[PDB]
From a paper:
The GTP-bound active form has a high affinity to downstream effector proteins, such as Raf, and triggers the mitogen-activated protein kinase (MAPK) pathway. This GTPase signalling is terminated by accelerated GTP hydrolysis catalysed by GTPase-activating proteins (GAPs).
In this complex, the α2-helix (residues 66–74), which overlaps with Switch II in sequence, deviates from the one in the Ras-GDP structure by 42° but it adopts a conformation highly similar to the GTP- or GTP analogue-bound unphosphorylated Ras structures with an angle difference of <7°. This demonstrates this RasWT-GDP-BeF3–complex is mimicking a GTP-bound GSA state. Therefore, it is highly significant that in our RasWT-GDP-BeF3– GSA complex structure there is no second water molecule within 7.8 Å of PG. Only the isolated nucleophilic water is in a near-attack conformation (NAC) at PG along with the two waters closely coordinated to the octahedral catalytic Mg2+. This NAC water has an in-line angle (O3B–Be–Ow) 161° and is 3.5 Å from the beryllium atom. It donates an H-bond directly to T35 and F3 and accepts a H-bond from Q61. It encompasses broader steric and conformational effects, significant for the biological roles of this crucial PTM of Ras, especially for its interactions with effector proteins such as Raf. These two BeF3– GSA complexes both capture a “closed” conformation where Y32 in Switch I directly interacts with Q61 in Switch II by H-bonding, different from other ground state conformations as depicted by caged-GTP, GMPPNP, GMPPCP, or GTPγS. Indeed, utilising 19F NMR on BeF3– GSA complexes reveals that Switch I predominantly adopts a “closed” conformation ( ~ 90% occupancy) in solution. The 10% population of RasWT-GDP-BeF3– GSA in “open” conformation explains why we could not crystallise this complex by co-crystallisation after many attempts and why its structure has been missing in the PDB.
Author numbering:
A (entry chain A), B (entry chain B): 1 to 166
Amino acid sequence: MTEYKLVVVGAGGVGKSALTIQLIQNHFVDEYDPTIEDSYRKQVVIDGETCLLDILDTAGQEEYSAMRDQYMRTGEGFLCVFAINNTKSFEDIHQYREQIKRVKDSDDVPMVLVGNKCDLAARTVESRQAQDLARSYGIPYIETSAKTRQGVEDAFYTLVREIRQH
Amino acid sequence: MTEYKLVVVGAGGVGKSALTIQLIQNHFVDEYDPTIEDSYRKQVVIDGETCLLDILDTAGQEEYSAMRDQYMRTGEGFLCVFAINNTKSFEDIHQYREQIKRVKDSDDVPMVLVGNKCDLAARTVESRQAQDLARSYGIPYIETSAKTRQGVEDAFYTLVREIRQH
Ligand SMILES: Nc1nc2c(ncn2[C@@H]2O[C@H](COP(=O)(O)OP(=O)(O)O)[C@@H](O)[C@H]2O)c(=O)[nH]1
Ligand SMILES: Nc1nc2c(ncn2[C@@H]2O[C@H](COP(=O)(O)OP(=O)(O)O)[C@@H](O)[C@H]2O)c(=O)[nH]1
Ligand code: BEF
Ligand code: BEF
Ligand SMILES: [Mg+2]
Ligand SMILES: [Mg+2]
């Protein structure tokens, strides 16, 4: 059992908790209950390795956020989530990544860019724009839907692979 | 705002996680995935006081028993859960109480005894038996169903009152 410390970050309402709860429960939360901080420990097998995923589900609402540097220091990899119908949330990614790099003293931090709510027909962030940003960072981009479950295991398992391969 | 460190304990499969998830997320989970350790932070008003509930959902599977001393040290109140269709879980919850007292070095630790799965017809632990045990401890007894949501808020809120009145 190999422990991986995953942290899920991004603006309020983008789907951090919904993605995480899908991974853990195979349930879609329809309600938006702004997170303070929840943590999970989930055993999974990824490429034949028994993994203990320590997942921190963080506050994206500024009103509820505290002490981001602390959880950035301890995290091994970061799921950086935006919503494809929220341009501001995409712009906020860049700031999350900058802060993570600063806290880690490194531009090579395990990270996956997640464009969530890909079940929504009306999007404002085109896939290619996000693919381009991820390419600039040298990290994977995965499109997800917590509603349909598209990409949920892919996003988390890819992040594990990025940590393993670090 | 007052923080309350609640810890949900008891044998594997009695419904600790299902209760916690009902309280927070207002849905019932049918699949059983044994907990390692999960934590939730949730703000609520109880008896005219704004409270931050820090809820630790613990492992009942004995393979994770090494983690107990730590969470028993830090926890302020314990939701002691058994299932009304599982007599072994009732016997076990007595040992949980004894262990908590030992770790705290105190006979008066805030606790609530919870008889879960009270939606099931095939009861093997009579309410009177659990009432007798709770009376011996000097603590409340509440019957719950994570499936129907019966008693769920009552259980957690009663535990907060037990801490406040300690
Ligand atoms: N249509 C759609 N709604 C989503 C999706 N992910 C989350 N939501 C909804 O978006 C809201 C906020 O999700 P939540 O995970 O609580 O946000 P966060 O934890 O603050 O990032 C809730 O109402 C969810 O039901 C998604 O992939 N598709
Ligand atoms: N009928 C019924 N099943 C329940 C109830 N609470 C939990 N369960 C089921 O019992 C199993 C174990 O629940 P879980 O919360 O994971 O147990 P834990 O190991 O104590 O956390 C799951 O299949 C749940 O769906 C309840 O109140 N009624
Ligand atoms: F949990 Be979300 F960031 F409000
Ligand atoms: F989460 Be249970 F105790 F397996
Ligand atoms: Mg959230
Ligand atoms: Mg559990």
